[PDB]
Ligand binder design. Structure first.
Ligand code: CLA
Ligand code: CLA
Ligand code: CLA
Ligand code: CLA
Ligand code: CLA
Ligand code: CLA
Ligand code: CLA
Ligand SMILES: CCCCCCCCCCCCCCCC(=O)OC[C@H](COP(=O)(O)OC[C@@H](O)CO)OC(=O)CCCCCCCCCCCCCCC
Ligand code: KC2
Ligand SMILES: CC1=C(C#C/C(C)=C/C=C/C(C)=C/C=C/C=C(C)/C=C/C=C(\C)C#CC2=C(C)C[C@@H](O)CC2(C)C)C(C)(C)C[C@H](O)C1
Ligand SMILES: CC1=C(C#C/C(C)=C/C=C/C(C)=C/C=C/C=C(C)/C=C/C=C(\C)C#CC2=C(C)C[C@@H](O)CC2(C)C)C(C)(C)C[C@H](O)C1
Lengths: 161, 194, 42, 181, 154, 174
């Protein structure tokens, strides 16, 4: 397929991975009686292992010669669920955490004792900030263009050189 | 100075009997931590959503739009059956409604920035039904009460759909009791997993 | 509830321990009900 | 009449075992002590009075209905479509299945929502000064002095007796399998 | 201090606009209450909004029935798509976009009506009572009230 | 001030005898909920449509226009609706009444502005409301007959939903 890779649903090495993983569990299950708790624990692990291999095969992942799934991350849309969408999901959470943390440090500067607000957090106000993070892309860009994100270079302490 | 709802507790501050549906019920003291304006905005919103949702379940049992994608009497099955494109259309339209009706004052730090903004009052009166100021207090009371009742009712209906794989009216008309041989609560750690 | 005890629970180490235990806990729960998510399913 | 002080008034006790409470006012037609659990302290007196008169009126009408339908007395052709039994329970179940009970339910509930609920709301709000249980339903005269006097007390006592007797009749029919008359 | 979720941007050290318009009271039928321009509710008010909906609902009736209605040998009418109208002078484009491209009911199998729901694709109204009563049922119908009666007699 | 129609209830505080067909009957307080001019325009609209509907039920049972028995066979009352939707009869009726209802919408919005009496489309081609006393009497007659025809229409169509007979045929049989 892409980069000489094979879809995991027709990879023979993927098929042997699934079989070897189950033979390894079945020989541990061969040492226990049917209704025992170790037998049910291993029978649930054989169900989980088979389910995972079935899902990967039908997902559009590509396997290598080694029979393991490989991720395509060049930007193509047929493979966006491996990096681009998990990445879009990450950056939304990361910017949320950043926007919310930034909003609280600016609040704490206007406090009676600014450093006491950072070791003893005003939890009702800090929870007010965490809820605000859901629209951080719009809130932060408007913050930028309204001249409130970036401070000018001449209000920042620098080393003499 | 005791609560009227809970007679053995002290009456909570930020609850002064002005708001509709105010009977002194805040035993956990959330009103002392969270501004009552935000709490009433969220209560009216949750209640309005649940009025539509409870009505949605019952009417969806009775009446359907045409087509096989809309033929699910059980409302929890309708979630999966309904066309995904149109369901995400509903979601996107809700988001557009949320930003515009709130006028870009969406968050915990900028909703109610305008002193004119009132909790739950979005300017929505298309037919001017609240034009009469004599009906205002009882409309506010019965909106809050309908919202609370529908929150409880929809919660019950959803979890009765989970327990009994039946739609709400025909669960009442073809009732089957809980055997307890299925859907036992908890237990993920009692058997140590699996 | 005592305000000095609530001011103690608002201290940075308690909130850090509680929040990251809560955060760790819904990752653990999400991987119980929805395991082996190597990809966003699409 | 009123007989204020003698019967139905302040200083009147049906059972002086229980002292007459202060919260129970002496101006409500039918007040003859009997407030043990102290409900008059916190309930709306106007609401509970209207509820009492309505429970009284149903009890009387239901008693009349039970007597007629246990004596075998009927309207022409009613026993033809409905059952021939005199068991009040059996008639109710088959008149439900006939739709007659549905029609009475429909029309009672219509009156009770379009007229009963506004009447209750105004009587408790303070917009109309309607005495409890009043619906201006006096077609055949017999009002005037009596209307606010003995008839209010006669109605309330016949209604309380009708409530107790109707409960008695239905439970006797339950424990025996045979109705009265 | 700041209570938490107060909503005022000056209590969270957030930059506010400083501009907070006074809230008027006038409303429009399919729009919302709020600050408008002067004269806006006079031209785009309830009168405008109701009238525009009325025209849109009237013009829906030709659109919901859009098609090429042609008579055969007798007076019988055949319905066809407007795509069958081949425009003569547009090079390689011979089948043209029409009003059926902005309102493609047929492709989704809708069968629109001037009342929005046609004989095919009609509203489905079922009865959830399933042809039995609230109490004292017999057969494949056991109501909740029957379950209360079953428990009390056991 | 108590209601003339419901004596134990109060006067409905938005209704006055200067209205046509007033009896003080608003027990549910809807005249306080909705704007009263809208309610008045709606009642007269419902009244006139139901008057046509009841008279049409009666007349359709009496006679039927030439050629109609071909297309409309055993169908009667609501039954003819689906067969004539296939034909363009109901489509044409809907088209022209909707066309009139755009102007009805403009009229109602002027009524809510307060420049028009409810239901007043100024339609008096033949002369009946020249005199003021006659005008008021006919206003009351129109409202009362329209109210009666609303209930009539209800009964007639539900009688079809029960027996399938039609008004005149339900009188003749059973
Ligand atoms: C190392 C440099 C590099 C960079 C920066 C990118 C960047 C990108 N590639 Mg990738 N690509 C690369 C090398 C690179 N590629 C190489 C070496 C190959 C092998 C030939 C590919 C093969 C490849 C394929 C096959 C495709 C991409 C696509 C894309 C674009 C999709 C991202 C997106 O959402 O934008 C576009 C979307 C928006 C701006 C908004 C979306 C909401 C993105 C611009 C996809 C694309 O759309 O091409 C333009 C696509 O189909 N790439
Ligand atoms: C939410 C608060 C916050 C925000 C907005 C930023 C913002 C930034 N930091 Mg980070 N930083 C923070 C907290 C924060 N910092 C803390 C707590 C530490 C101590 C570990 C650091 C240590 C740190 C280093 C060493 C570096 C940065 C860098 C940067 C820059 C690039 C982003 C990055 O590399 O992230 C990296 C983030 C980290 C390495 C640690 C973040 C740890 C957590 C997730 C954030 C704190 C959450 C906080 C408790 C919020 C609570 C809010 C609540 C009270 C409402 C950017 C200026 C880099 C830079 O200058 O590049 C230009 C860089 O080299 N920061
Ligand atoms: C940008 C405008 C736009 C466009 C072009 C479309 C286009 C489409 N929609 Mg979508 N839709 C939109 C906005 C839009 N939608 C919005 C804003 C919502 C959210 C309210 C929806 C919700 C939605 C759902 C739920 C469904 C569609 C479906 C469809 C498709 C088939 C349509 C069809 O056969 O119609 C011809 C059929 C009709 C016109 C019948 C209409 C039925 C009535 C009018 C519904 C009652 C409306 C109800 C009262 C909603 C009130 C709330 C609202 C005012 C906020 C088509 C691709 C369907 C789909 O995905 O099919 C695969 C589907 O099931 N849409
Ligand atoms: C307000 C209560 C009421 C009244 C006044 C009547 C009155 C009447 N019913 Mg009855 N009926 C009633 C309730 C009532 N019904 C109810 C509730 C039902 C449903 C169970 C019926 C079911 C019913 C049927 C099935 C029939 C009547 C008939 C009749 C008429 C025949 C009387 C006759 O010739 O004497 C008969 C006298 C005797 C038998 C005594 C000997 C009479 C007008 C008959 C009818 O339609 O005639 C026009 C008839 O066949 N009734
Ligand atoms: C013994 C019963 C009794 C008594 C004393 C009263 C007395 C009163 N009622 Mg009440 N009422 C009753 C029963 C009674 N009612 C019942 C059962 C109903 C439901 C139908 C009503 C419904 C009612 C309304 C809706 C209203 C009143 C009102 C009034 C007042 C004025 C009317 C009046 O004086 O005429 C009463 C005249 C008589 C009681 C004469 C006797 C007629 C008898 C009881 C008929 C018997 C029927 C039949 C033969 C049953 C016996 C046979 C059966 C066993 C088989 C007065 C306080 C009005 C008021 O102002 O309330 C405050 C009002 O608005 N009543
Ligand atoms: C709510 C009103 C209403 C509705 C929906 C219908 C609908 C229908 N009628 Mg009925 N009809 C009506 C009123 C109504 N009619 C009235 C008022 C009469 C006369 C008393 C009739 C007499 C009638 C007959 C005899 C027949 C129908 C038939 C039909 C069907 C075919 C349409 C047709 O050609 O009718 C034709 C009907 C007419 C030409 C009468 C129209 C009456 C108009 C509205 C009077 C308006 C005059 C008034 C002064 C206003 C002037 C307008 C001005 C403001 C510009 C259709 C289902 C036919 C059918 O299929 O029956 C089985 C049929 O043969 N109608
Ligand atoms: C929508 C209602 C409707 C329908 C379906 C028909 C249908 C028909 N008409 Mg009728 N017609 C109607 C209304 C209608 N007409 C009205 C309102 C009038 C005015 C009084 C007429 C007057 C009329 C005449 C005078 C004749 C027809 C005739 C015909 C038939 C043509 C052969 C045809 C089946 C002809 C026919 O064959 O009559 C039997 C004929 O001669 N029509
Ligand atoms: C305002 C809204 C009010 C919501 C009310 C909630 C109603 C439903 C609550 C449970 C109903 C009855 C439970 C019996 C069921 C029961 O007790 O089962 C027991 C179960 C543990 O299993 P065991 O050790 O009992 O196994 C026992 C053996 O018999 C079987 O193996 O307890 C749990 O931990 C399950 C709940 C999850 C605990 C964490 C929940 C998520 C945490 C989120 C943050 C805190 C939220 C509140 C946590 C309490
Ligand atoms: C001639 C082109 C034209 C057409 C074909 C057309 C059709 C419809 C329909 C048809 C189905 C409806 C239902 C409708 C309703 C509304 N129109 Mg209207 N409309 C047209 C022109 C304008 C302009 C220029 C404005 C405007 C507005 C509004 C507002 C909001 C008022 C409010 O929120 O206060 C509402 C509810 C104003 C605005 O604010 O739009 C955001 C505004 O300036 N319209 N409009
Ligand atoms: C914002 C927010 C709130 C909220 C909220 C909520 C929960 C709002 C939810 C709203 C919903 C559920 C809206 C649903 C709209 C459905 C539509 C338009 C269906 C269209 C069908 C079509 C086009 C078709 C078709 C056809 C097809 C394809 C083929 C045929 O075989 C079948 C068929 C003929 C039918 C509230 C107001 C509560 C409060 C607060 O302010 C915050
Ligand atoms: C405001 C506004 C207007 C408007 C509007 C609208 C859309 C108004 C609609 C309001 C609605 C939909 C109110 C619905 C309330 C529902 C309740 C209280 C249900 C509670 C259920 C319970 C208690 C239960 C239960 C159950 C349980 C769990 C067990 C089950 O087995 C069964 C059972 C069902 C019995 C308009 C647009 C006209 C314009 C105007 O200018 C302004």
């Amino acid at each position: 397929d892409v980069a000489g890779l094979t879809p995991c649903g027709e990879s023979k090495e993927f098929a042997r991975r699934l079989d070897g993983s189950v033979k390894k569990l079945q020989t541990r299950l061969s040492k226990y009686e049917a209704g025992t708790p170790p037998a049910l624990a291993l029978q649930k692990q054989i169900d989980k292992t088979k389910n995972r291999f079935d899902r990967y095969g039908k997902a559009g992942l590509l396997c290598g010669t080694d029979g393991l799934p490989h991720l395509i991350t060049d930007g193509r849309w047929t493979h966006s669920g491996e990096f681009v969408i998990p990445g879009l999901l990450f950056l939304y959470v990361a910017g949320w955490i950043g926007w919310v943390g930034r909003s609280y440090v600016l609040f704490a500067r206007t406090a009676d004792k600014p450093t006491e607000k950072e070791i003893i957090i005003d939890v009702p106000v800090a929870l007010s900030f965490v809820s605000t993070g859901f629209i951080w892309p719009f809130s932060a860009f408007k913050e930028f263009t309204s001249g409130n994100l970036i401070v000018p270079a001449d209000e920042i302490t620098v080393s003499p050189r | 100075a005791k609560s009227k709802a809970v007679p053995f507790l002290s009456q909570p501050e930020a609850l002064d009997g002005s708001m509709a549906g105010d009977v002194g019920f805040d035993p956990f003291g959330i009103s002392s931590v969270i501004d009552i304006k935000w709490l009433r905005e969220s209560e009216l919103k949750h209640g309005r959503i649940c009025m539509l949702a409870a009505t949605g379940c019952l009417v969806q049992e009775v009446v359907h739009l045409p087509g096989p994608a809309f033929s699910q009497k059980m409302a929890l099955n309708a979630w999966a059956a309904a066309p995904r494109g149109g369901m995400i259309s509903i979601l996107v339209a809700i988001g557009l409604i949320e930003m515009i009706s709130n006028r870009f004052a969406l968050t915990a730090t900028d909703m109610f920035a305008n002193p004119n903004r009132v909790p739950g009052d979005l300017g929505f009166d298309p037919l001017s039904l609240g034009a009469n100021p004599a009906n205002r207090a009882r409309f506010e009371l019965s909106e809050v009460i309908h919202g609370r009742a529908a929150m409880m009712g929809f919660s019950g209906m959803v979890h009765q759909m989970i327990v009994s794989k039946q739609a709400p009216i025909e669960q009442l008309m073809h009732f089957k009791a809980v055997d307890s041989s299925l859907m036992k609560l908890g237990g993920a750690a009692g058997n140590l997993g699996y | 509830m005592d305000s000095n005890f609530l001011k103690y629970l608002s201290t940075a180490p308690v909130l850090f321990t509680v929040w990251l235990s809560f955060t760790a806990s819904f990752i653990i729960e999400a991987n119980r009900f929805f395991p082996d998510m190597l990809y966003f399913p699409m | 009449l009123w007989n204020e002080g003698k019967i139905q008034g302040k200083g009147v006790s049906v059972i002086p075992l229980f002292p007459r409470p202060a919260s129970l006012d002496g101006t409500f037609p039918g007040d003859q002590g009997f407030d043990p659990f102290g409900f008059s302290s916190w309930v709306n007196m106007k609401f509970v009075a209207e509820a009492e008169i309505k429970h009284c009126r149903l009890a009387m009408l239901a008693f009349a209905g039970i007597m007629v339908e246990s004596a075998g007395i009927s309207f022409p052709g009613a026993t033809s479509v409905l059952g021939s039994s005199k068991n009040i329970f059996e008639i109710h179940d088959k008149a439900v299945a006939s739709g007659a009970m549905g029609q009475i339910l429909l029309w009672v509930s219509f009156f009770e929502v379009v007229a009963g609920v506004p009447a209750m709301n105004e009587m408790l709000n303070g917009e109309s000064s309607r005495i409890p249980g009043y619906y201006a339903f006096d077609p055949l005269g017999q009002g005037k002095g009596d209307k606010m006097g003995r008839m209010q007390l006669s109605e309330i006592q016949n209604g309380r007796l009708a409530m107790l007797a109707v409960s008695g009749i239905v439970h006797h029919t339950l424990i025996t399998g045979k109705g009265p008359l | 201090d700041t209570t938490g979720f107060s909503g005022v941007p000056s209590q969270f050290a957030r930059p506010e606009s400083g501009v907070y318009p006074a809230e008027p009271t006038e409303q429009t039928f399919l729009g919302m209450r709020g600050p408008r321009a002067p004269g806006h509710r006079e031209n785009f008010g309830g009168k405008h909004t109701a009238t525009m909906l009325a025209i849109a609902a009237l013009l829906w009736q030709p659109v919901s029935e859009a098609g090429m209605y042609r008579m055969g040998a007798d007076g019988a009418l055949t319905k066809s798509s407007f795509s069958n109208m081949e425009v003569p002078g547009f090079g390689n484009m011979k089948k043209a976009p029409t009003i059926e491209s902005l309102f493609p009911f047929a492709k989704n199998g809708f069968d629109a009506s001037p009342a929005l729901f046609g004989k095919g694709s009609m509203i489905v109204v079922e009865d959830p009572r399933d042809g039995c009563g609230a109490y004292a049922n017999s057969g494949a119908c056991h109501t909740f009230l029957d379950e209360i009666g079953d428990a009390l007699k056991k | 001030a108590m209601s003339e129609s419901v004596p134990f209830l109060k006067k409905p505080e938005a209704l006055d005898s200067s209205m046509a067909g007033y009896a003080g009957f608003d027990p549910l307080g809807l005249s306080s909920i909705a704007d009263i001019k809208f309610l008045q325009e709606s009642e007269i609209k419902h009244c006139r449509i139901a008057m046509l509907a009841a008279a049409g039920s009666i007349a359709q049972d009496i006679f039927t226009f030439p050629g109609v028995s071909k297309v409309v066979g055993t169908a009667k009352m609501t039954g003819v609706h689906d067969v004539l939707v296939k034909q363009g009869a109901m489509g044409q009726i809907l088209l022209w009444t909707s066309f009139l209802e755009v102007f009805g919408t403009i009229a109602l919005l002027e009524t809510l502005d307060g420049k028009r009496a409810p239901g007043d489309f100024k339609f008096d081609p033949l002369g009946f409301s020249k005199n003021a006393e006659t005008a008021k009497r006919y206003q009351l007659s129109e409202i009362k007959n329209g109210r009666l025809a609303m209930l009539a229409t209800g009964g007639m169509v539900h009688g079809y939903f029960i027996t399938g007979k039609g008004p005149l045929e339900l009188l003749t049989n059973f």
